[PDB]
Every structure is written in structure tokens, then in C-alpha cells.
Enzyme design. Structure first.
Site, short mmCIF file in Angstrom:
data_model
loop_
_atom_site.label_atom_id
_atom_site.label_comp_id
_atom_site.label_asym_id
_atom_site.label_seq_id
_atom_site.Cartn_x
_atom_site.Cartn_y
_atom_site.Cartn_z
N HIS A 270 0.75 -1.24 0.00
CA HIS A 270 0.00 0.00 0.00
C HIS A 270 0.80 1.31 0.00
O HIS A 270 0.18 2.36 -0.10
CB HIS A 270 -0.97 0.03 1.20
CG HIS A 270 -1.95 -1.08 1.19
ND1 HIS A 270 -2.86 -1.26 0.15
CD2 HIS A 270 -2.13 -2.13 2.02
CE1 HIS A 270 -3.54 -2.37 0.36
NE2 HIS A 270 -3.14 -2.91 1.50
N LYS B 17 -4.19 -10.16 -7.68
CA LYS B 17 -4.91 -9.55 -6.57
C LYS B 17 -6.01 -8.66 -7.16
O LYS B 17 -5.74 -7.85 -8.05
CB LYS B 17 -3.98 -8.76 -5.65
CG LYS B 17 -4.68 -8.26 -4.41
CD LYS B 17 -3.70 -7.53 -3.45
CE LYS B 17 -4.31 -7.21 -2.08
NZ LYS B 17 -4.77 -5.82 -1.92
N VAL C 231 -8.08 -6.16 -6.12
CA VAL C 231 -8.21 -4.75 -5.77
C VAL C 231 -7.05 -4.37 -4.87
O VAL C 231 -6.71 -5.09 -3.93
CB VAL C 231 -9.54 -4.44 -5.04
CG1 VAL C 231 -9.62 -3.05 -4.53
CG2 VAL C 231 -10.75 -4.85 -5.96
N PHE D 212 -5.35 -1.85 4.98
CA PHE D 212 -5.99 -0.73 4.29
C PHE D 212 -7.47 -1.03 4.21
O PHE D 212 -7.89 -1.99 3.53
CB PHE D 212 -5.41 -0.52 2.90
CG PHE D 212 -5.82 0.79 2.30
CD1 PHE D 212 -7.02 0.89 1.57
CD2 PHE D 212 -5.03 1.95 2.49
CE1 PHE D 212 -7.43 2.10 1.04
CE2 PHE D 212 -5.46 3.16 1.97
CZ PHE D 212 -6.64 3.20 1.22
N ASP D 213 -8.29 -0.26 4.94
CA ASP D 213 -9.72 -0.58 5.00
C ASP D 213 -10.56 0.01 3.85
O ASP D 213 -11.41 -0.70 3.25
CB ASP D 213 -10.28 -0.19 6.38
CG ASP D 213 -11.58 -0.93 6.72
OD1 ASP D 213 -11.58 -2.17 6.63
OD2 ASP D 213 -12.60 -0.28 7.10
CL LIG Z 1 -6.82 -2.11 -0.92
#
Ligand SMILES: [Cl-]
Ligand SMILES: [Cl-]
Ligand SMILES: [Cl-]
Ligand SMILES: [Cl-]
Length: 124
Positions: free
Chosen positions: A12, A41, A43, A120-121
Site C-alpha cells: 500500500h 490480486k 483490488v 488498508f480498509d
Molecule cells: Cl486495498
């Protein structure tokens, strides 16, 4: 095994650019951060701020996480981010991503000593 904090950094953080340069940013970064190894992956969000500024979010506004846990924090300021999501033409291998740049608040889950981001929400 990768630590949770280190996994967050790899997935991230992209402090080396102010913003997604182009439509191919996600194809490149998803591959280079080893997010397309055995599966694409689907997203993933990258944050274009310093690591210090992203870590600092863990002492900013405490908010619920989507999953109902209470260790999430929402950045006081907006941050430059790029969302990467697989397109319909994406089929492992040869993953394919849409790149969407935005300036949004981030929400991260924090854990540990030091108390740092581990998930990461969402962005708002
Ligand atoms: Cl994400
Ligand atoms: Cl590592
Ligand atoms: Cl670590
Ligand atoms: Cl930096």
C-alpha cells in the site's frame, strides 16, 4: 513470514511519486510489488505520501472498520492515492488493471508496538 506492518508497506505505500503518472501505473506496480504471483490480486490501493504521514494516521480519528473492529483510523487530511482494480480483460497470468487516481481520506487498521498500519480498509 512477512510481518503485518511490512506487508502493509509493500502492498500500500508508494511514496516515490506524487500521483499515478498514467493508465499503466497499476499494471506495473501490481507486478513489481509481487501482487500477481499465483493469482491477480483483484483490488489494491497505493498511497502517495510519506511512510511517516501514513503511520501518523494511527493517532488520528478512530473509526469503525468495515468488519466491526475498533482499531481503524481515518486520516484527517486527504491523501493522494491510486486504486488498482482488475478489468474484464484480466486473466492470470497477464493480469490487467484499471488505474484510478484520487485525493481521498484513507482508513487503516493499526496494531502493535509501535502502533502502525496493518490493513488498508477504505478511502473516503
Ligand atoms: Cl486495498
Ligand atoms: Cl518483509
Ligand atoms: Cl516490520
Ligand atoms: Cl517520502
Amino acid at each position: 513470514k512477512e510481518t503485518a506492518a511490512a506487508k502493509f508497506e509493500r502492498q500500500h505505500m508508494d511514496s516515490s511519486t506524487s500521483a499515478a503518472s498514467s493508465s499503466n501505473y497499476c499494471n506495473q506496480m501490481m507486478k513489481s510489488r509481487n501482487l500477481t504471483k499465483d493469482r491477480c490480486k483483484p483490488v489494491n490501493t497505493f498511497v502517495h505520501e510519506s511512510l511517516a504521514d501514513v503511520q501518523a494516521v494511527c493517532s488520528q480519528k478512530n473509526v469503525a472498520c468495515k468488519n466491526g473492529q475498533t482499531n481503524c483510523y481515518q486520516s484527517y487530511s486527504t491523501m493522494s492515492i491510486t486504486d488498482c482494480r482488475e478489468t474484464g480483460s484480466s486473466k492470470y497470468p497477464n493480469c490487467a488493471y484499471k488505474t484510478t487516481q484520487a485525493n481521498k481520506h484513507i482508513i487503516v487498521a493499526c496494531e502493535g508496538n509501535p502502533y502502525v498500519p496493518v490493513h488498508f480498509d477504505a478511502s473516503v
